């Protein structure tokens, strides 16, 4: 259950999201999300 974003992501926005995800899902889930986003970022770049 997540929002669909149609505008850009900058560093401030990622900190807000990681914060919001830690509160809703907890630290374990967030760690997996983080490793997956890293892979996507490196690949596109």
């Amino acid at each position: 259950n997540l929002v669909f974003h149609n505008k850009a992501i900058n560093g401030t926005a990622m900190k807000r999201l990681i914060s919001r995800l830690i509160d809703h899902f907890g630290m374990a889930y967030t760690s997996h999300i983080l490793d997956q986003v890293k892979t996507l970022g490196f690949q596109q770049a």
Binding site: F4, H5, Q36
Partner: protein, 127 residues
């Protein structure tokens, strides 16, 4: 990593940048599931920034401004089509939403899919 995320979500040229002459005198792809869209990107059918329409079966989660419809087109038998900037909502006489379509780019769908799949994967692993 941040550079990559920004590029995926950066967007597309909107008006003068994409068309030379006013569109008045005179995007196309429509996809049914997100998987197909990601696929077209690979087969080089579309580019990362090209606009596309995706059917949405869920409940209006798209962050967008509070903007009233640009044009509402209403037909005599009873169906009304509402065109907002990032979405088209088709409704009928019984006041039921027959379809919702979102205007987006492949890059946006890719980030959503990764976040969603990771959540579901962790869940299925525990079991």
């Amino acid at each position: 990593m941040l550079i990559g995320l920004y590029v995926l979500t950066s967007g597309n040229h909107r008006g003068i940048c994409v068309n030379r002459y006013n569109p008045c005198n005179r995007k196309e792809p429509f996809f049914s599931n997100s998987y197909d869209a990601i696929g077209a990107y690979r087969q080089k059918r579309i580019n990362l920034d090209s606009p596309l329409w995706l059917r949405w079966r869920l409940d209006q989660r798209v962050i967008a401004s509070r903007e009233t419809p640009i044009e509402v087109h209403y037909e005599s038998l009873g169906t009304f089509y509402e065109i907002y900037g990032h979405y088209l909502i088709v409704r009928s006489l019984k006041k039921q939403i027959l379809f919702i379509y979102i205007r987006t780019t492949v890059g946006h769908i890719a980030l959503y899919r990764e976040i969603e799949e990771a959540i579901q994967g962790f869940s299925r692993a525990y079991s």
